[PDB]
PDB file of N, CA and C in Angstrom:
ATOM      1  N   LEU A  54     -12.444  27.592  -8.494  1.00 36.11           N
ATOM      2  CA  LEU A  54     -12.922  28.002  -7.174  1.00 36.11           C
ATOM      3  C   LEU A  54     -12.204  27.288  -6.061  1.00 36.11           C
ATOM      4  N   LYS A  55     -12.477  27.723  -4.832  1.00 35.24           N
ATOM      5  CA  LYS A  55     -11.945  27.060  -3.650  1.00 35.24           C
ATOM      6  C   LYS A  55     -12.513  25.668  -3.560  1.00 35.24           C
ATOM      7  N   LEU A  56     -13.643  25.466  -4.185  1.00 36.37           N
ATOM      8  CA  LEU A  56     -14.305  24.200  -4.148  1.00 36.37           C
ATOM      9  C   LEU A  56     -13.708  23.267  -5.163  1.00 36.37           C
ATOM     10  N   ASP A  57     -13.029  23.799  -6.166  1.00 39.29           N
ATOM     11  CA  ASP A  57     -12.485  22.909  -7.140  1.00 39.29           C
ATOM     12  C   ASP A  57     -11.160  22.482  -6.589  1.00 39.29           C
ATOM     13  N   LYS A  58     -10.498  23.401  -5.873  1.00 40.28           N
ATOM     14  CA  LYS A  58      -9.239  23.028  -5.283  1.00 40.28           C
ATOM     15  C   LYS A  58      -9.503  22.193  -4.093  1.00 40.28           C
ATOM     16  N   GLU A  59     -10.610  22.427  -3.393  1.00 38.62           N
ATOM     17  CA  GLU A  59     -10.848  21.647  -2.219  1.00 38.62           C
ATOM     18  C   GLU A  59     -11.195  20.255  -2.648  1.00 38.62           C
ATOM     19  N   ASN A  60     -11.928  20.098  -3.748  1.00 36.56           N
ATOM     20  CA  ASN A  60     -12.254  18.759  -4.169  1.00 36.56           C
ATOM     21  C   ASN A  60     -11.041  18.058  -4.737  1.00 36.56           C
ATOM     22  N   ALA A  61     -10.223  18.773  -5.504  1.00 31.63           N
ATOM     23  CA  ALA A  61      -9.031  18.177  -6.057  1.00 31.63           C
ATOM     24  C   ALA A  61      -8.059  17.881  -4.946  1.00 31.63           C
ATOM     25  N   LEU A  62      -8.037  18.739  -3.932  1.00 33.30           N
ATOM     26  CA  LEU A  62      -7.203  18.558  -2.779  1.00 33.30           C
ATOM     27  C   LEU A  62      -7.740  17.435  -1.981  1.00 33.30           C
ATOM     28  N   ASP A  63      -9.048  17.312  -1.844  1.00 36.54           N
ATOM     29  CA  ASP A  63      -9.555  16.190  -1.102  1.00 36.54           C
ATOM     30  C   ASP A  63      -9.120  14.946  -1.844  1.00 36.54           C
ATOM     31  N   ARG A  64      -9.129  14.970  -3.176  1.00 37.83           N
ATOM     32  CA  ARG A  64      -8.640  13.798  -3.856  1.00 37.83           C
ATOM     33  C   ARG A  64      -7.166  13.605  -3.566  1.00 37.83           C
ATOM     34  N   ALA A  65      -6.371  14.673  -3.591  1.00 36.74           N
ATOM     35  CA  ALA A  65      -4.953  14.563  -3.324  1.00 36.74           C
ATOM     36  C   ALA A  65      -4.632  14.249  -1.895  1.00 36.74           C
ATOM     37  N   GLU A  66      -5.373  14.836  -0.985  1.00 39.66           N
ATOM     38  CA  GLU A  66      -5.153  14.692   0.429  1.00 39.66           C
ATOM     39  C   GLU A  66      -5.590  13.339   0.833  1.00 39.66           C
ATOM     40  N   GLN A  67      -6.724  12.912   0.309  1.00 38.16           N
ATOM     41  CA  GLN A  67      -7.179  11.603   0.595  1.00 38.16           C
ATOM     42  C   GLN A  67      -6.250  10.647  -0.080  1.00 38.16           C
ATOM     43  N   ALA A  68      -5.753  10.956  -1.277  1.00 36.32           N
ATOM     44  CA  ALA A  68      -4.824  10.055  -1.920  1.00 36.32           C
ATOM     45  C   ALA A  68      -3.563   9.952  -1.070  1.00 36.32           C
ATOM     46  N   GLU A  69      -3.119  11.049  -0.447  1.00 37.15           N
ATOM     47  CA  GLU A  69      -1.975  10.998   0.449  1.00 37.15           C
ATOM     48  C   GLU A  69      -2.322  10.180   1.691  1.00 37.15           C
ATOM     49  N   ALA A  70      -3.554  10.317   2.196  1.00 37.39           N
ATOM     50  CA  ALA A  70      -4.047   9.534   3.322  1.00 37.39           C
ATOM     51  C   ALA A  70      -4.158   8.073   2.917  1.00 37.39           C
ATOM     52  N   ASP A  71      -4.492   7.843   1.653  1.00 34.81           N
ATOM     53  CA  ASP A  71      -4.610   6.527   1.090  1.00 34.81           C
ATOM     54  C   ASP A  71      -3.242   6.006   0.848  1.00 34.81           C
ATOM     55  N   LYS A  72      -2.277   6.889   0.597  1.00 34.76           N
ATOM     56  CA  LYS A  72      -0.911   6.469   0.447  1.00 34.76           C
ATOM     57  C   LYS A  72      -0.472   6.083   1.804  1.00 34.76           C
ATOM     58  N   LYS A  73      -0.867   6.830   2.825  1.00 34.88           N
ATOM     59  CA  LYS A  73      -0.485   6.406   4.135  1.00 34.88           C
ATOM     60  C   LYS A  73      -1.070   5.050   4.378  1.00 34.88           C
ATOM     61  N   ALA A  74      -2.357   4.867   4.098  1.00 32.08           N
ATOM     62  CA  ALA A  74      -2.992   3.589   4.320  1.00 32.08           C
ATOM     63  C   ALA A  74      -2.424   2.488   3.441  1.00 32.08           C
ATOM     64  N   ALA A  75      -2.110   2.794   2.186  1.00 27.67           N
ATOM     65  CA  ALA A  75      -1.567   1.839   1.241  1.00 27.67           C
ATOM     66  C   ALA A  75      -0.169   1.494   1.635  1.00 27.67           C
ATOM     67  N   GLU A  76       0.538   2.476   2.177  1.00 29.09           N
ATOM     68  CA  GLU A  76       1.877   2.298   2.666  1.00 29.09           C
ATOM     69  C   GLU A  76       1.770   1.541   3.951  1.00 29.09           C
ATOM     70  N   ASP A  77       0.747   1.800   4.755  1.00 29.77           N
ATOM     71  CA  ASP A  77       0.639   1.037   5.968  1.00 29.77           C
ATOM     72  C   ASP A  77       0.374  -0.385   5.572  1.00 29.77           C
ATOM     73  N   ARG A  78      -0.464  -0.604   4.572  1.00 34.46           N
ATOM     74  CA  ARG A  78      -0.688  -1.966   4.186  1.00 34.46           C
ATOM     75  C   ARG A  78       0.555  -2.584   3.601  1.00 34.46           C
ATOM     76  N   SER A  79       1.287  -1.868   2.753  1.00 33.13           N
ATOM     77  CA  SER A  79       2.437  -2.471   2.136  1.00 33.13           C
ATOM     78  C   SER A  79       3.621  -2.575   3.075  1.00 33.13           C
ATOM     79  N   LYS A  80       3.757  -1.681   4.041  1.00 31.39           N
ATOM     80  CA  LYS A  80       4.893  -1.806   4.920  1.00 31.39           C
ATOM     81  C   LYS A  80       4.558  -2.890   5.909  1.00 31.39           C
ATOM     82  N   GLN A  81       3.269  -3.029   6.259  1.00 34.57           N
ATOM     83  CA  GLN A  81       2.862  -4.072   7.164  1.00 34.57           C
ATOM     84  C   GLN A  81       2.991  -5.395   6.469  1.00 34.57           C
ATOM     85  N   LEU A  82       2.662  -5.456   5.178  1.00 38.23           N
ATOM     86  CA  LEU A  82       2.807  -6.688   4.450  1.00 38.23           C
ATOM     87  C   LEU A  82       4.258  -7.008   4.283  1.00 38.23           C
ATOM     88  N   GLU A  83       5.121  -6.011   4.072  1.00 35.85           N
ATOM     89  CA  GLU A  83       6.532  -6.317   3.980  1.00 35.85           C
ATOM     90  C   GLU A  83       6.986  -6.829   5.344  1.00 35.85           C
ATOM     91  N   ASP A  84       6.528  -6.207   6.442  1.00 36.38           N
ATOM     92  CA  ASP A  84       6.883  -6.678   7.779  1.00 36.38           C
ATOM     93  C   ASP A  84       6.348  -8.071   7.959  1.00 36.38           C
ATOM     94  N   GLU A  85       5.202  -8.338   7.355  1.00 39.61           N
ATOM     95  CA  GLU A  85       4.624  -9.647   7.411  1.00 39.61           C
ATOM     96  C   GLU A  85       5.183 -10.540   6.310  1.00 39.61           C
ATOM     97  N   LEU A  86       5.940 -10.027   5.340  1.00 37.17           N
ATOM     98  CA  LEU A  86       6.570 -10.981   4.461  1.00 37.17           C
ATOM     99  C   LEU A  86       7.727 -11.451   5.256  1.00 37.17           C
ATOM    100  N   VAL A  87       8.245 -10.563   6.088  1.00 34.46           N
ATOM    101  CA  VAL A  87       9.310 -10.947   6.952  1.00 34.46           C
ATOM    102  C   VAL A  87       8.740 -11.867   7.993  1.00 34.46           C
ATOM    103  N   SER A  88       7.594 -11.568   8.601  1.00 33.59           N
ATOM    104  CA  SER A  88       7.095 -12.487   9.598  1.00 33.59           C
ATOM    105  C   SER A  88       6.694 -13.787   8.948  1.00 33.59           C
ATOM    106  N   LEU A  89       6.207 -13.770   7.708  1.00 31.51           N
ATOM    107  CA  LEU A  89       5.829 -15.016   7.103  1.00 31.51           C
ATOM    108  C   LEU A  89       7.030 -15.769   6.658  1.00 31.51           C
ATOM    109  N   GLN A  90       8.041 -15.078   6.152  1.00 32.36           N
ATOM    110  CA  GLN A  90       9.257 -15.716   5.709  1.00 32.36           C
ATOM    111  C   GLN A  90       9.984 -16.245   6.912  1.00 32.36           C
ATOM    112  N   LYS A  91       9.953 -15.491   8.001  1.00 34.61           N
ATOM    113  CA  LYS A  91      10.575 -15.832   9.254  1.00 34.61           C
ATOM    114  C   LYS A  91       9.866 -17.002   9.865  1.00 34.61           C
ATOM    115  N   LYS A  92       8.539 -17.005   9.795  1.00 31.23           N
ATOM    116  CA  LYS A  92       7.763 -18.093  10.323  1.00 31.23           C
ATOM    117  C   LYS A  92       7.844 -19.277   9.381  1.00 31.23           C
ATOM    118  N   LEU A  93       8.031 -19.032   8.076  1.00 33.06           N
ATOM    119  CA  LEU A  93       8.218 -20.073   7.075  1.00 33.06           C
ATOM    120  C   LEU A  93       9.504 -20.754   7.430  1.00 33.06           C
ATOM    121  N   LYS A  94      10.545 -19.953   7.696  1.00 35.63           N
ATOM    122  CA  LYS A  94      11.844 -20.446   8.085  1.00 35.63           C
ATOM    123  C   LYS A  94      11.787 -20.962   9.493  1.00 35.63           C
ATOM    124  N   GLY A  95      10.891 -20.431  10.300  1.00 35.70           N
ATOM    125  CA  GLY A  95      10.676 -20.943  11.627  1.00 35.70           C
ATOM    126  C   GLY A  95      10.261 -22.384  11.420  1.00 35.70           C
ATOM    127  N   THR A  96       9.267 -22.596  10.543  1.00 35.70           N
ATOM    128  CA  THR A  96       8.803 -23.916  10.221  1.00 35.70           C
ATOM    129  C   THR A  96       9.863 -24.692   9.448  1.00 35.70           C
ATOM    130  N   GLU A  97      10.661 -24.077   8.582  1.00 38.05           N
ATOM    131  CA  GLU A  97      11.670 -24.829   7.843  1.00 38.05           C
ATOM    132  C   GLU A  97      12.749 -25.342   8.786  1.00 38.05           C
ATOM    133  N   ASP A  98      13.130 -24.511   9.750  1.00 35.66           N
ATOM    134  CA  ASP A  98      14.130 -24.858  10.736  1.00 35.66           C
ATOM    135  C   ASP A  98      13.564 -25.975  11.578  1.00 35.66           C
ATOM    136  N   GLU A  99      12.293 -25.848  11.940  1.00 38.10           N
ATOM    137  CA  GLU A  99      11.622 -26.872  12.686  1.00 38.10           C
ATOM    138  C   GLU A  99      11.450 -28.113  11.815  1.00 38.10           C
TER     139      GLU A  99
ATOM    140  N   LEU B 120      -5.899  29.080  -5.172  1.00 36.25           N
ATOM    141  CA  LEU B 120      -7.187  28.420  -5.390  1.00 36.25           C
ATOM    142  C   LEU B 120      -7.479  28.083  -6.848  1.00 36.25           C
ATOM    143  N   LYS B 121      -7.505  29.087  -7.712  1.00 35.29           N
ATOM    144  CA  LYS B 121      -7.859  28.880  -9.123  1.00 35.29           C
ATOM    145  C   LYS B 121      -7.101  27.763  -9.826  1.00 35.29           C
ATOM    146  N   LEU B 122      -5.801  27.682  -9.599  1.00 34.73           N
ATOM    147  CA  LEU B 122      -4.982  26.677 -10.245  1.00 34.73           C
ATOM    148  C   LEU B 122      -4.722  25.542  -9.318  1.00 34.73           C
ATOM    149  N   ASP B 123      -5.343  25.573  -8.163  1.00 33.24           N
ATOM    150  CA  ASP B 123      -5.099  24.564  -7.186  1.00 33.24           C
ATOM    151  C   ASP B 123      -5.954  23.398  -7.504  1.00 33.24           C
ATOM    152  N   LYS B 124      -7.051  23.592  -8.224  1.00 33.31           N
ATOM    153  CA  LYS B 124      -7.748  22.385  -8.605  1.00 33.31           C
ATOM    154  C   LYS B 124      -6.813  21.578  -9.485  1.00 33.31           C
ATOM    155  N   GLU B 125      -6.004  22.273 -10.290  1.00 33.39           N
ATOM    156  CA  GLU B 125      -5.077  21.648 -11.204  1.00 33.39           C
ATOM    157  C   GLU B 125      -3.850  21.158 -10.478  1.00 33.39           C
ATOM    158  N   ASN B 126      -3.372  21.922  -9.499  1.00 34.52           N
ATOM    159  CA  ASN B 126      -2.180  21.511  -8.792  1.00 34.52           C
ATOM    160  C   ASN B 126      -2.537  20.339  -7.933  1.00 34.52           C
ATOM    161  N   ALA B 127      -3.739  20.369  -7.381  1.00 34.56           N
ATOM    162  CA  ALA B 127      -4.221  19.324  -6.531  1.00 34.56           C
ATOM    163  C   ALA B 127      -4.687  18.166  -7.367  1.00 34.56           C
ATOM    164  N   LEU B 128      -5.118  18.399  -8.600  1.00 37.57           N
ATOM    165  CA  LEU B 128      -5.475  17.281  -9.433  1.00 37.57           C
ATOM    166  C   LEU B 128      -4.210  16.556  -9.811  1.00 37.57           C
ATOM    167  N   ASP B 129      -3.150  17.307 -10.137  1.00 37.81           N
ATOM    168  CA  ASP B 129      -1.883  16.698 -10.470  1.00 37.81           C
ATOM    169  C   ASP B 129      -1.289  16.101  -9.215  1.00 37.81           C
ATOM    170  N   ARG B 130      -1.516  16.752  -8.067  1.00 37.60           N
ATOM    171  CA  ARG B 130      -1.049  16.227  -6.811  1.00 37.60           C
ATOM    172  C   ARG B 130      -1.774  14.945  -6.566  1.00 37.60           C
ATOM    173  N   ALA B 131      -3.081  14.901  -6.856  1.00 34.24           N
ATOM    174  CA  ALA B 131      -3.861  13.700  -6.718  1.00 34.24           C
ATOM    175  C   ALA B 131      -3.370  12.679  -7.688  1.00 34.24           C
ATOM    176  N   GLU B 132      -2.979  13.064  -8.890  1.00 29.79           N
ATOM    177  CA  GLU B 132      -2.498  12.038  -9.786  1.00 29.79           C
ATOM    178  C   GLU B 132      -1.232  11.449  -9.207  1.00 29.79           C
ATOM    179  N   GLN B 133      -0.362  12.294  -8.656  1.00 33.92           N
ATOM    180  CA  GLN B 133       0.862  11.808  -8.060  1.00 33.92           C
ATOM    181  C   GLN B 133       0.632  11.060  -6.759  1.00 33.92           C
ATOM    182  N   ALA B 134      -0.273  11.553  -5.932  1.00 33.86           N
ATOM    183  CA  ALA B 134      -0.578  10.969  -4.651  1.00 33.86           C
ATOM    184  C   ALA B 134      -1.254   9.650  -4.881  1.00 33.86           C
ATOM    185  N   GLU B 135      -2.063   9.579  -5.936  1.00 33.79           N
ATOM    186  CA  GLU B 135      -2.717   8.357  -6.320  1.00 33.79           C
ATOM    187  C   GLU B 135      -1.668   7.456  -6.926  1.00 33.79           C
ATOM    188  N   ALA B 136      -0.722   8.005  -7.688  1.00 34.00           N
ATOM    189  CA  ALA B 136       0.333   7.189  -8.252  1.00 34.00           C
ATOM    190  C   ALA B 136       1.153   6.569  -7.133  1.00 34.00           C
ATOM    191  N   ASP B 137       1.338   7.307  -6.037  1.00 33.78           N
ATOM    192  CA  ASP B 137       2.107   6.807  -4.921  1.00 33.78           C
ATOM    193  C   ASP B 137       1.277   5.934  -4.004  1.00 33.78           C
ATOM    194  N   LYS B 138      -0.035   6.192  -3.877  1.00 35.60           N
ATOM    195  CA  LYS B 138      -0.821   5.307  -3.046  1.00 35.60           C
ATOM    196  C   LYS B 138      -0.973   4.051  -3.825  1.00 35.60           C
ATOM    197  N   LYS B 139      -0.982   4.162  -5.160  1.00 35.52           N
ATOM    198  CA  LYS B 139      -1.069   3.043  -6.042  1.00 35.52           C
ATOM    199  C   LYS B 139       0.224   2.297  -5.970  1.00 35.52           C
ATOM    200  N   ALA B 140       1.365   2.972  -6.033  1.00 35.38           N
ATOM    201  CA  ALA B 140       2.582   2.212  -5.939  1.00 35.38           C
ATOM    202  C   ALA B 140       2.615   1.482  -4.614  1.00 35.38           C
ATOM    203  N   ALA B 141       2.187   2.145  -3.539  1.00 34.71           N
ATOM    204  CA  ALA B 141       2.144   1.505  -2.251  1.00 34.71           C
ATOM    205  C   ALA B 141       1.112   0.395  -2.249  1.00 34.71           C
ATOM    206  N   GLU B 142      -0.021   0.597  -2.917  1.00 34.24           N
ATOM    207  CA  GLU B 142      -1.100  -0.367  -3.021  1.00 34.24           C
ATOM    208  C   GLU B 142      -0.714  -1.513  -3.925  1.00 34.24           C
ATOM    209  N   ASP B 143       0.054  -1.230  -4.970  1.00 36.74           N
ATOM    210  CA  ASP B 143       0.528  -2.252  -5.866  1.00 36.74           C
ATOM    211  C   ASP B 143       1.498  -3.055  -5.073  1.00 36.74           C
ATOM    212  N   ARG B 144       2.303  -2.391  -4.229  1.00 31.75           N
ATOM    213  CA  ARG B 144       3.181  -3.137  -3.369  1.00 31.75           C
ATOM    214  C   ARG B 144       2.325  -3.912  -2.412  1.00 31.75           C
ATOM    215  N   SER B 145       1.255  -3.334  -1.891  1.00 31.72           N
ATOM    216  CA  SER B 145       0.431  -4.086  -0.979  1.00 31.72           C
ATOM    217  C   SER B 145      -0.088  -5.329  -1.679  1.00 31.72           C
ATOM    218  N   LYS B 146      -0.526  -5.217  -2.926  1.00 35.34           N
ATOM    219  CA  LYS B 146      -1.004  -6.383  -3.637  1.00 35.34           C
ATOM    220  C   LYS B 146       0.099  -7.394  -3.896  1.00 35.34           C
ATOM    221  N   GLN B 147       1.270  -6.929  -4.301  1.00 32.97           N
ATOM    222  CA  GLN B 147       2.396  -7.792  -4.594  1.00 32.97           C
ATOM    223  C   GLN B 147       2.891  -8.461  -3.338  1.00 32.97           C
ATOM    224  N   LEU B 148       2.860  -7.725  -2.249  1.00 31.19           N
ATOM    225  CA  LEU B 148       3.298  -8.181  -0.968  1.00 31.19           C
ATOM    226  C   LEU B 148       2.227  -9.092  -0.432  1.00 31.19           C
ATOM    227  N   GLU B 149       0.985  -8.829  -0.818  1.00 32.48           N
ATOM    228  CA  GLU B 149      -0.135  -9.667  -0.422  1.00 32.48           C
ATOM    229  C   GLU B 149       0.021 -11.010  -1.127  1.00 32.48           C
ATOM    230  N   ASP B 150       0.470 -10.983  -2.380  1.00 33.77           N
ATOM    231  CA  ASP B 150       0.676 -12.206  -3.122  1.00 33.77           C
ATOM    232  C   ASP B 150       1.866 -12.942  -2.552  1.00 33.77           C
ATOM    233  N   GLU B 151       2.915 -12.208  -2.161  1.00 30.85           N
ATOM    234  CA  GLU B 151       4.073 -12.835  -1.558  1.00 30.85           C
ATOM    235  C   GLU B 151       3.761 -13.339  -0.181  1.00 30.85           C
ATOM    236  N   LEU B 152       2.938 -12.641   0.572  1.00 32.50           N
ATOM    237  CA  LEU B 152       2.631 -13.055   1.919  1.00 32.50           C
ATOM    238  C   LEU B 152       1.892 -14.332   1.819  1.00 32.50           C
ATOM    239  N   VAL B 153       0.933 -14.373   0.911  1.00 33.90           N
ATOM    240  CA  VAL B 153       0.135 -15.533   0.673  1.00 33.90           C
ATOM    241  C   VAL B 153       0.998 -16.647   0.162  1.00 33.90           C
ATOM    242  N   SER B 154       1.920 -16.358  -0.745  1.00 32.56           N
ATOM    243  CA  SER B 154       2.813 -17.375  -1.249  1.00 32.56           C
ATOM    244  C   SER B 154       3.651 -17.912  -0.104  1.00 32.56           C
ATOM    245  N   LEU B 155       4.146 -17.016   0.755  1.00 34.56           N
ATOM    246  CA  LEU B 155       4.927 -17.401   1.903  1.00 34.56           C
ATOM    247  C   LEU B 155       4.063 -18.158   2.856  1.00 34.56           C
ATOM    248  N   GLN B 156       2.793 -17.793   2.981  1.00 32.60           N
ATOM    249  CA  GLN B 156       1.874 -18.492   3.847  1.00 32.60           C
ATOM    250  C   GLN B 156       1.606 -19.870   3.300  1.00 32.60           C
ATOM    251  N   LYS B 157       1.474 -20.002   1.990  1.00 34.08           N
ATOM    252  CA  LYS B 157       1.261 -21.307   1.414  1.00 34.08           C
ATOM    253  C   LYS B 157       2.493 -22.151   1.615  1.00 34.08           C
ATOM    254  N   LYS B 158       3.663 -21.536   1.458  1.00 31.40           N
ATOM    255  CA  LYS B 158       4.916 -22.212   1.674  1.00 31.40           C
ATOM    256  C   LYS B 158       5.141 -22.475   3.146  1.00 31.40           C
ATOM    257  N   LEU B 159       4.680 -21.566   4.008  1.00 30.26           N
ATOM    258  CA  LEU B 159       4.788 -21.689   5.448  1.00 30.26           C
ATOM    259  C   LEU B 159       3.987 -22.856   5.848  1.00 30.26           C
ATOM    260  N   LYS B 160       2.773 -22.950   5.312  1.00 30.18           N
ATOM    261  CA  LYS B 160       1.855 -24.025   5.590  1.00 30.18           C
ATOM    262  C   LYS B 160       2.375 -25.251   4.905  1.00 30.18           C
ATOM    263  N   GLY B 161       3.058 -25.087   3.795  1.00 31.72           N
ATOM    264  CA  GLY B 161       3.675 -26.224   3.176  1.00 31.72           C
ATOM    265  C   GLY B 161       4.622 -26.800   4.217  1.00 31.72           C
ATOM    266  N   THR B 162       5.476 -25.940   4.784  1.00 32.12           N
ATOM    267  CA  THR B 162       6.429 -26.330   5.795  1.00 32.12           C
ATOM    268  C   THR B 162       5.781 -26.622   7.149  1.00 32.12           C
ATOM    269  N   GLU B 163       4.645 -26.019   7.483  1.00 30.70           N
ATOM    270  CA  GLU B 163       4.013 -26.264   8.772  1.00 30.70           C
ATOM    271  C   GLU B 163       3.310 -27.600   8.728  1.00 30.70           C
ATOM    272  N   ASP B 164       2.678 -27.903   7.602  1.00 34.46           N
ATOM    273  CA  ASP B 164       1.986 -29.151   7.458  1.00 34.46           C
ATOM    274  C   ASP B 164       3.043 -30.206   7.373  1.00 34.46           C
ATOM    275  N   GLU B 165       4.155 -29.879   6.710  1.00 33.52           N
ATOM    276  CA  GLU B 165       5.286 -30.754   6.621  1.00 33.52           C
ATOM    277  C   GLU B 165       5.893 -30.919   8.018  1.00 33.52           C
TER     278      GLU B 165
END
């Protein structure tokens, strides 16, 4: 039914939204591995 | 619709696989951020 696709799609769509969120978390963490590494090196340089 | 529960379920498996890969990266990056933070603080306290 449309409801089985809608539910499976909600899982897929939400999973894509969760990928966006998971990607936002991981790209932000990578940006923050850079900020932490940069700040680590900021502190290492200091 | 009829096969979309299946296409969307497989899409969800893939979307979940990718939100998971992104989330696994978030966790790995979270561990690295934390490691960098511990090292940053190692260097900041230093």
